[PDB]
């Protein structure tokens, strides 16, 4: 009655019989931009069902040695379905997100994944190792797309900050002996009412194993982690030709 759940939006429905409730980032549901917060004057377009639906974008394999991965929003969807087209044809974009991370195993497997959302997740480099070289991360690392990217130094989140304090952000855990999914609802987070879906990534989704995956020889060794997400209250403005970046 808190373990079972159904998430229906658009022409897609998700089910889970081993949930752990739902998290609503910073305690507030997504919403459309009010006429007093807005600034751009053109009438926005709100596609609704064609873009506010669940998209399953990627599957990673959880291994005994995995370090963790991250994805950037809205980067992950800029080239998928109708949402992508609208993000490409419009200068302005804004929306919320419902993130559903899936990972099931057996009552004999163990391990725990920390699933968290970190706004304005700026990536840092190791500065040439000695820290005397001012290097910068490449586009494929700041905006990895749907395939995401693997963390090199999870302890410091590849940005000189302690992952041990990541729980100060909207998060959930996937502890195999307890639940097989994590659901986080995120409102639009920015210092502006609208912004570019291409140049700016509002937040990053981190999925990091804190307690290593383990099991005995003979049990299914392939344990996938699938990422499904849905935009909420998508709004677009500033129409012109399509642009990919």
């Amino acid at each position: 009655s808190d373990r079972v759940a159904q998430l229906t939006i658009g022409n897609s429905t998700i089910t889970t019989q081993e949930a752990a409730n739902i998290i609503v980032g910073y305690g507030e549901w997504p919403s459309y931009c009010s006429d007093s917060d807005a600034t751009a004057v053109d009438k926005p377009t709100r596609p609704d069902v064609s873009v506010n639906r669940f998209y399953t974008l990627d599957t990673k394999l959880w291994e005994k040695s995995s370090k963790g991965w991250y994805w950037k929003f809205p980067d992950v969807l800029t080239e998928t379905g109708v949402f992508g087209q609208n993000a490409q044809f419009h200068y302005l974009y804004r929306s919320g997100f419902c993130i559903h991370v899936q990972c099931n195993a057996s009552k004999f497997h163990q391990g725990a994944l920390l699933v968290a959302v970190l706004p304005e997740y700026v990536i840092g480099t190791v500065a040439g190792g000695t820290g005397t070289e001012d290097t910068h991360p490449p586009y494929k690392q700041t905006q990895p797309g749907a395939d995401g990217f693997e963390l090199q130094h999870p302890y410091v989140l590849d940005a000189g900050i302690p992952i041990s304090q990541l729980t100060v952000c909207p998060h959930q855990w996937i502890n195999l002996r307890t639940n097989n999914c994590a659901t986080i609802i995120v409102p639009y987070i920015n210092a502006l009412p609208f912004d570019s879906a291409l140049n700016h990534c509002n937040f990053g989704l981190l999925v990091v194993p804190i307690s290593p995956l383990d099991y005995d020889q003979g049990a299914t060794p392939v344990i996938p982690i699938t990422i499904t997400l849905a935009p909420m209250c998508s709004e677009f403005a500033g129409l012109r030709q399509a642009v990919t970046q």
Partner: protein, 58 residues
């Protein structure tokens, strides 16, 4: 005082008690802030809240 409303906190959910001698409010002192807190926004942002006595997962 009849000054300008150009402070960074003009229209905040917490009222301040400040001092100023200029026509621009941001020139004012820091004053005292309102002692309101909302821990749940960070410590308990769950959709369906669960009691203390009961078992969180049922």
């Amino acid at each position: 005082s009849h000054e300008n409303s150009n402070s960074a906190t003009e229209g905040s959910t917490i009222n301040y008690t400040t001092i100023n001698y200029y026509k621009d409010s941001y020139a004012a002192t820091a004053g005292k802030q309102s002692l309101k807190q909302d821990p749940d926004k960070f410590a308990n942002p769950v959709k369906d809240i669960f009691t203390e006595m009961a078992a969180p997962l049922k």
